[PDB]
Design a protein around this ligand. Sequence first.
Ligand SMILES: [Cl-]
Ligand SMILES: [Cl-]
Lengths: 175, 175
Amino acid sequence: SHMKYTNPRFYKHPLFKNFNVTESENYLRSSTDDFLIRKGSRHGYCVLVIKFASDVFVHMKIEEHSEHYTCSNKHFEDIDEVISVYVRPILRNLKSIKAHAKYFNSPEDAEKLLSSFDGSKVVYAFYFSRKYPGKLTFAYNNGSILEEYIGVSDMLTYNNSTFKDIDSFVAYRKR
Amino acid sequence: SHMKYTNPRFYKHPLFKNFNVTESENYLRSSTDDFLIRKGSRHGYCVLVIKFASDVFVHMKIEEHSEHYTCSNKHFEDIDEVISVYVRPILRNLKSIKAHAKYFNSPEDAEKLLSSFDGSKVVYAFYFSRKYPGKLTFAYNNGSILEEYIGVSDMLTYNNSTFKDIDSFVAYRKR
Ligand SMILES: [Cl-]
Ligand SMILES: [Cl-]
C-alpha cells in the first residue's frame, strides 16, 4: 500500500502478534498454536505464519486494503474469513497428511524405508519439504530415488491435478 | 458497494458495453466476440458475460473497489488482469472442449450416440449444460443414461479433482 495515518486495522486483531520471522517461528516451535499472524517488514500487510512441522514454517503475505484483505490472490472480507476460508482447511489437510501411514517427519528418517527396496515393488514415502516450506515431498524408489513436490493448501496439488488426501493422490500417481 | 459521486471506473474500459442481460446475449449471439462486460443492475459492479455456446451464457459479477476488482473470489489489479488471468484461460479451455472427439453441441444431438449402446462398452458424450450455464455435462450409458457436472474455469473441475482437458478427465473417470 502506502502509508496511512491510522494504525493498520489488523493490529487490533487478537491473532496479530508483534513478532518478526525468528520470534514467530520461535514462539510457534514451543507453543501448541499452529499459526499466528505477524507484523510485515514494510507497510500495508501482515503475514500469516503456519507451522507445518517443528522446522517448517509457511509465511503468507496478507494485504490490508480499505475494507477487504487479500491473501494468495484470493479476496477476504476480514481476517476471520482468511482463517476459516483459508487457514483451517490447510490445517485439516496438514492433520491428514501426518496421519498417513506413508508420512514421515524427516527426509533423513524416510531414508530407512526408501533403502528397503527389493525390486519387488515401488517404495514411496512422504515428508514436508524444507527447501520449499509449504511443499510435501513425494519420494519414491523404483531403482533410483526420485522426488516430486506436492502443494499443500486446502487440497493437495500436483501439476495440473488436485486431491483431497494422499490416498487419492497415490491412486492417481500409480495408474 | 455503495454509491459514489464519480462514474464507476469500468465505464471507461473498452470492453464495457452498456447492455442488460438480453442485449448482451443478443449481441453475443450474432457477434464473433466471445465475451464482453456489461452493466450491473445495481451499483458497485459490472458483469463479465462469456458465450459458452449459441444459447449458453455465463454471467460473472466483477466488483469494483477503490483500486482493485474482484471476480469469483479472486482479486485483480484491473479489468485487463481479469481478462488475462481469468477469461482467456476459460476461452482456451472452451476451445479444447469443443474440439474434443466426444463433445456435442446439443443434448438432443448427443442423444444419438447415447442410444447406440450395445452392451459392448460404456458410451459417453459431453455437452454444455443449459440448466447450469458454466457446467459441462458428462453423459454416459452403461445400461442406464447417467449425467455428471464438470465445472469450466481454466481447468475442468469434477468434485474434488481438477483436469486440463477432457482426455485426462476420461482417464481418471474410467479407472
Ligand atoms: Cl477489495
Ligand atoms: Cl483490494
